[PDB]
Amino acid sequence: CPLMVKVLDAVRGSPAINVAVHVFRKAADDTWEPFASGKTSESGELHGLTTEEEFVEGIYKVEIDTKSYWKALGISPFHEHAEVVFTANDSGPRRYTIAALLSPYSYSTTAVVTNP
Amino acid sequence: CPLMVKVLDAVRGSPAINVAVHVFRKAADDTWEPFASGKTSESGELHGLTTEEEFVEGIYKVEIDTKSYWKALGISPFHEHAEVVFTANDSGPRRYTIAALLSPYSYSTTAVVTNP
Amino acid sequence: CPLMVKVLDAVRGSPAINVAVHVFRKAADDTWEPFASGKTSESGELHGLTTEEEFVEGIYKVEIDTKSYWKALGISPFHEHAEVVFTANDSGPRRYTIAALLSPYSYSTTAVVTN
């Protein structure tokens, strides 16, 4: 459980369910390598992306597929995705929750980082 | 558990702990009557404010004491509090989570409303 | 002009036009007394609320009538209004912009305080 993603919908006042999320990690040659992916649950949460063994230090990009979410609801949104790019585990393993709050022309994101 | 408040700190990347929260309900004479109060836990959550019997229809104000929070951390913030004012339980009982994300000169708030 | 209010709409990607805004000043008995008010322009702005002479230190509340805004657009909203409560302090910079970004079940607000 070192990486969890939580997504909320600011139009509905609800969890954002069935949101696709893709995680990438920067490789030594500066390309973005696929790392993990999944879908938010009925609570708007996505657990089980990685393990503490797999989730090594690096630069990670969490791409939340907001356009796909809004289009499935019949809405034409502004953004293609919401991206969150950060260095992880640089002073040892941490647990990361990446949260996003979505509207059709806006989003907010925050991180909660805890030390187990 | 029909009303829960969750507070996050956007400077630290952490739950906002020990945040005082006061809830008021508009009375028939248009004054704000004290309704419930409490403090966020180490997870940034405040549970147990009210009961489904007590939490009747009305207009409620959730005042999150952000200035007091920032001052206890040695920071001089802009706002006195963050306030969230809404009509509750007008089409029957609902469960409400009021969330706030705090910075010294800014805040965001959202509501998650679910039907049990 | 020491106080400006800016309102944006996160659903339509636009300024929030013709939004009623009321400013109150906290009185000695802790009641809120009306101070200034108006409606946002086509750019989502409300200028001319007060003057340097009038805008003394104290606690002010800016109430933005978001419920009426959303209903006039045909959208069901959560909040009754958004309110921003702050202290004006002469030791800090002299122009205050209160900005708000509105969604039906959420809002964001920030202060930009400059000289």
Add this chain to the structure above:
Amino acid sequence: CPLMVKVLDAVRGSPAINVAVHVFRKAADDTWEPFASGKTSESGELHGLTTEEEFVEGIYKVEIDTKSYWKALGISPFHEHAEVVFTANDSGPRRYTIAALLSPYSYSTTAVVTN
């Protein structure tokens, strides 16, 4: 000018001054090609990025160098950068303002698209 970027600082309550901003356009092979760049002004704004003739429909990415911004202020930041990815569409309004509100572990962004 069809594209403007506005950056605000939620810790200091100010414009985010001298922030590097890079705009990229998605190429046919899905790579990001540099399109425009600059540094925000004293008002937190970056004007003059492109012209109507240059700013054709397509997918664009605006990368805001928030990590450098925070470090120059002595504050420890979470993100490497903030990036805003969107499609320019000629069927919608013609001026795009991309606004971002920065905190060390969070950011908010909105689009204001007007004629």
